[PDB]
């Protein structure tokens, strides 16, 4: 009813905004800054997750009918959007740390395409980390009175290990890297007069840092509840506390709502690049 309608609305808005920003950035692709190309790549890592909405819309309408391959692709895309976002934001925050504190940047004055190879490497890591979702997803009929719904299918022995490795990597390497880099950036920026020596090469640096920090705060605020929920799940499966077989509905609805919020982040990004920074 309402779910297909809002899925269609999200698809339209996200596709329009992300296509617009990608075209705007690519119109001047002959020469791009490091921040500009990182934003371009985390937008092309998001257009795919926007494209995959109508599948879930028709799934919520009647039933999944597309097949196993489309299910694998959709699951892999959802699990790769977060990895691409986290790794790209960690790289951009490390670049900001290099520019601010040490002032020894080499992306533009060094090798011509260091940024391109870094992005290719993070794409490779994203695909390698998404392989477990590629290999363990199928459209099982489940024999539930015509209820062919996409779901994982594990031997139940390595599910906890896979979940804990996913959480550790994707929410503890980028988290620590970004926290350290931004702590040092703020410490160096609260107690300095001029970055380099100028008043025209210092203002734009602060503007760029403002844009990047609002982007990463939006990303964290959108993608944190899902990982907190999965952390609660993995702690529950290890027999830590609060196992009572009564909160399963709560964790399921929490997973659903956090997945919805992660889907909304796609349309949140372009308007953020729109109103601030003009």
């Amino acid at each position, epitope marked *: 009813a309402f779910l297909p309608a809002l899925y269609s609305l999200l698809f339209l808005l996200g596709l329009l905004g992300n296509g617009a920003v990608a075209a705007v950035l690519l119109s001047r692709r002959t020469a791009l800054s490091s921040t500009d190309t990182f934003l371009l790549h985390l937008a092309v890592a998001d257009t795919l997750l926007v494209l995959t909405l109508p599948l879930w819309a028709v799934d919520a309408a009647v039933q999944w009918v597309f097949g196993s391959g489309l299910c694998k692709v959709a699951g892999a895309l959802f699990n790769i959007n977060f990895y691409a976002g986290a790794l790209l934001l960690a790289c951009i925050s490390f670049d900001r740390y290099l520019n601010i504190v040490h002032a020894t940047q080499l992306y533009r004055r060094g090798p011509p395409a260091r940024v391109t190879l870094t992005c290719l490497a993070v794409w490779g890591l994203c695909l390698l980390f998404a392989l477990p979702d590629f290999i363990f997803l199928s459209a099982h009929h489940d024999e539930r009175l015509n209820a062919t719904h996409c779901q994982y299918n594990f031997p139940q022995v390595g599910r906890t290990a896979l979940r804990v490795l996913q959480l550790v990597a994707g929410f503890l390497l980028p988290l620590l890297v970004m926290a350290y880099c931004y702590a040092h950036i703020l410490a160096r*920026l*609260k107690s300095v*007069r001029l970055l380099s020596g100028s*008043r025209e090469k*210092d203002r734009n640096l*602060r503007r760029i*840092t403002r844009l990047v920090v609002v982007v990463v705060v939006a990303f964290a605020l959108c993608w944190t509840p899902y990982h907190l929920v999965v952390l609660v799940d993995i702690l529950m499966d290890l027999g830590a506390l609060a196992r009572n077989c009564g909160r399963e509905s709560r964790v399921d609805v929490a997973k659903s709502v956090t997945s919805g919020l992660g889907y909304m982040h796609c349309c949140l990004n372009p308007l953020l690049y729109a109103f601030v920074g003009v």
Partner: nanobody
Amino acid sequence: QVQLQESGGGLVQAGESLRLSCAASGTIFRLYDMGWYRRELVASITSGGSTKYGDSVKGRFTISRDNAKNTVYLQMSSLKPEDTAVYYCNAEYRTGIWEELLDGWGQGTQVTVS
């Protein structure tokens, strides 16, 4: 968006000493530099306590700063009639952590000796 209060100027006899005080108020995130100018600098002090004087000053004038009140003071001893001029307080400030550094001059004061 910065108000500068200047005090200390007025009538004084020759061969005496005077104290000029300049204070800054408003929505300021931080203050970095301060100084006094006649179009040329006479005494400048940074946030780190370093003091710079012009070529026409033989270390006679004393410049001090108080960051608690964000107030700068300039003491001149053994004044001369040639010191009769107009002195303008200066200040460099940042109004926000993401904002450009920019400076705002003061109204100015008149100093006359003998």
